[PDB]
Amino acid sequence: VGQFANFVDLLQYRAKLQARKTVFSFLADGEAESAALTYGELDQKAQAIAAFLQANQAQGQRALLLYPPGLEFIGAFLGCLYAGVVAVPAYPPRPNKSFDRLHSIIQDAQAKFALTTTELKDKIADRLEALEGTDFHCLATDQVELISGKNWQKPNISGTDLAFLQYTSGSTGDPKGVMVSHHNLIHNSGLINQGFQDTEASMGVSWLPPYHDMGLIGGILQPIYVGITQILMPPVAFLQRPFRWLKAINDYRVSTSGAPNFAYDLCASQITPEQIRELDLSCWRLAFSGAEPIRAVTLENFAKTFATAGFQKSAFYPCYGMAETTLIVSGGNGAAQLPQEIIVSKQGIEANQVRPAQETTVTLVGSGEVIGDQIVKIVDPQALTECTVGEIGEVWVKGESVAQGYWQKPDLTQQQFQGNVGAETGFLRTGDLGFLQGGELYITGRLKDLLIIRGRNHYPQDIELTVEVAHPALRQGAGAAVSVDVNGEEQLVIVQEVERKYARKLNVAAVAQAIRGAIAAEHQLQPQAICFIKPGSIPKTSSGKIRRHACKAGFLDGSLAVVGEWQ
Numbered sequence: 001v002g003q004f005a006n007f008v009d010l011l012q013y014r015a016k017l018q019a020r021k022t023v024f025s026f027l028a029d030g031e032a033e034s035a036a037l038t039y040g041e042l043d044q045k046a047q048a049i050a051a052f053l054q055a056n057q058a059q060g061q062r063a064l065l066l067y068p069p070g071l072e073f074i075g076a077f078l079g080c081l082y083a084g085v086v087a088v089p090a091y092p093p094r095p096n097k098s099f100d101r102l103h104s105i106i107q108d109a110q111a112k113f114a115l116t117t118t119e120l121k122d123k124i125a126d127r128l129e130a131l132e133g134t135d136f137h138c139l140a141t142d143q144v145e146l147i148s149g150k151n152w153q154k155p156n157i158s159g160t161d162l163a164f165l166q167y168t169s170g171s172t173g174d175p176k177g178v179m180v181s182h183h184n185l186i187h188n189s190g191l192i193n194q195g196f197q198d199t200e201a202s203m204g205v206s207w208l209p210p211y212h213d214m215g216l217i218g219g220i221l222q223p224i225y226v227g228i229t230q231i232l233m234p235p236v237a238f239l240q241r242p243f244r245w246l247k248a249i250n251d252y253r254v255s256t257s258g259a260p261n262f263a264y265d266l267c268a269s270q271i272t273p274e275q276i277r278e279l280d281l282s283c284w285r286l287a288f289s290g291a292e293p294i295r296a297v298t299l300e301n302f303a304k305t306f307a308t309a310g311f312q313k314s315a316f317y318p319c320y321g322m323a324e325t326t327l328i329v330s331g332g333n334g335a336a337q338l339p340q341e342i343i344v345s346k347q348g349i350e351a352n353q354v355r356p357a358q359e360t361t362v363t364l365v366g367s368g369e370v371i372g373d374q375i376v377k378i379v380d381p382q383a384l385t386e387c388t389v390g391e392i393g394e395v396w397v398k399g400e401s402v403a404q405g406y407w408q409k410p411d412l413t414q415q416q417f418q419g420n421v422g423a424e425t426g427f428l429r430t431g432d433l434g435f436l437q438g439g440e441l442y443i444t445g446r447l448k449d450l451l452i453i454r455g456r457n458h459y460p461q462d463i464e465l466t467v468e469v470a471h472p473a474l475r476q477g478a479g480a481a482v483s484v485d486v487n488g489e490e491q492l493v494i495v496q497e498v499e500r501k502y503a504r505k506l507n508v509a510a511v512a513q514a515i516r517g518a519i520a521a522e523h524q525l526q527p528q529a530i531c532f533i534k535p536g537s538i539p540k541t542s543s544g545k546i547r548r549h550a551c552k553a554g555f556l557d558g559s560l561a562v563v564g565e566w567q
């Protein structure tokens with residue numbers, strides 16, 4: 001299984017050894033099973049979608065995948081890998097909504113094809129002719145006869161061949177196209193396994209969106225790499241009823257499931273004690289947390305709320321990675337059983353220094369140990385010099401899981417993927433600030449979002465966290481801290497969402513004073529402005545990640561749903 005150069009060779013091996021073993025079982029409601037596929041059935045569907053793609057002239061071309069969460073997406077993705085089509089996964093179009101995001105990906109990828117369901121094709125095909133022209137082909141893959149796979153021409157695949165374009169969320173700018181090779185998929189899959197240590201006997205459940213990151217290389221490809229059964233449900237099922245995630249873990253004895261930090265909080269806040277009494281989570285040995293700052297308070301609250309249900313905090317597996325690194329770089333608590341946490345000086349962090357406080361203290365959770373034969377270095381963003389111990393700098397990654405570059409973006413590719421430091425070359429600039437401590441990599445935040453006000457460095461998420469809890473009328477997770485230029489000097493602007501219940505009876509001055517008071521105590525900062533926005537109006541990615549730069553653009557252009565303003 002570890003001699004496989006690509007996932008096409010690998011699934012074909014699994015379709016022989018475990019043909020009748022169930023690979024994916026989809027619960028459309030997060031409760032009852034709706035559909036399933038065996039390794040043999042997944043292989044056959046893949047050869048058939050492949051043959052449909054090759055006859056449709058898609059080989060060597062880029063194809064958008066537009067599918068609802070389900071097994072059709074999975075089959076279309078593996079069909080593209082079998083066919084030699086560069087797949088471009090994306091969130092599907094939704095009703096009463098624009099296709100701007102989708103057209104922008106089509107223009108960037110120079111895609112000639114959209115792969116979708118019969119239902120969506122009948123609703124979007126003419127809109128795609130309007131936007132992309134007649135030479136663009138919206139194809140449906142859900143009604144391909146399985147006998148078509150007899151006409152599949154196996155491409156001569158090498159690991160250096162490009163498999164798919166993984167587009168970034170667009171939190172810091174425009175989505176960029178990550179060129180993920182076949183070797184990138186195989187190398188990182190092994191890296192996830194050197195850390196997760198899963199076996200053919202491991203069970204998995206995943207509500208994560210299948211389009212990108214943890215949902216695709218981990219929720220779809222890792223089950224196939226390890227030869228295990230994965231239970232899958234739509235993210236909306238978990239979001240509406242978080243108990244469905246933990247009930248599935250209990251029901252199928254799931255060993256390995258995980259999600260971003262916010263999901264652990266929602267499970268803790270929205271699961272009743274009667275529901276906790278229906279749970280047995282002793283089966284959960286790896287509970288991963290990635291794609292978002294891991295907060296120490298969230299780890300403790302989950303461990304405390306669910307210890308009666310058998311959850312152990314030793315199961316928490318902190319992990320870090322990005323699309324430019326395929327998926328994972330660091331993970332695990334090392335020789336420790338519990339996620340390593342350091343208590344350091346707040347003002348020190350604002351000064352790129354990690355030191356004890358002698359000064360308010362901050363608690364930082366490690367994002368894991370560098371997994372495998374990859375090399376992580378902490379470098380100064382401007383001087384391109386390697387930071388010493390206790391210094392905070394840009395995380396730099398050199399390894400075989402580093403993507404080939406950004407699609408049709410040559411200048412940015414040389415800048416971010418040709419990182420030179422001292423006598424070293426070939427490093428990827430992650431754009432993430434952090435530091436090395438205890439063999440563990442800690443992450444402080446994103447460079448492009450870092451706020452520099454009054455000669456001090458301020459992390460936007462640290463300020464957003466203070467504002468959300470300042471008044472009950474503020475919606476948590478729906479706020480942005482941005483720097484605007486006032487007379488040549490940088491100042492702080494807060495764009496925060498008000499709660500739907502508090503929108504009509506909102507005391508702008510009272511809540512603004514609660515906000516100014518909290519930011520001054522914790523950050524010694526005075527907001528130039530506080531813009532209160534309507535519930536659900538914050539510029540967000542398709543994932544839900546806040547676009548802070550677009551909040552500053554909208555404040556400066558007046559495009560926000562303003563229900564209140566302070567200046």
Ligand SMILES: CCCCCCCCCCCCCCCC(=O)OP(=O)(O)OC[C@H]1O[C@@H](n2cnc3c(N)ncnc32)[C@H](O)[C@@H]1O
Nearest residue numbers: 204213218222290291292293319320321322323328367443
């Ligand atoms: C059968 C068993 C199943 C197997 C499952 C395996 C799956 C587990 C591996 C997930 C490893 C995590 C990667 C996430 C990718 C992504 O997140 O994709 P991407 O959209 O490119 O965002 C990138 C930016 O997210 C921010 N970020 C990511 N990790 C952060 C952190 N630990 N702490 C703070 N910030 C963080 C950061 O800023 C980063 O650069």
Ligand SMILES: [Mg+2]
Nearest residue numbers: 168172322431
């Ligand atoms: Mg990024």
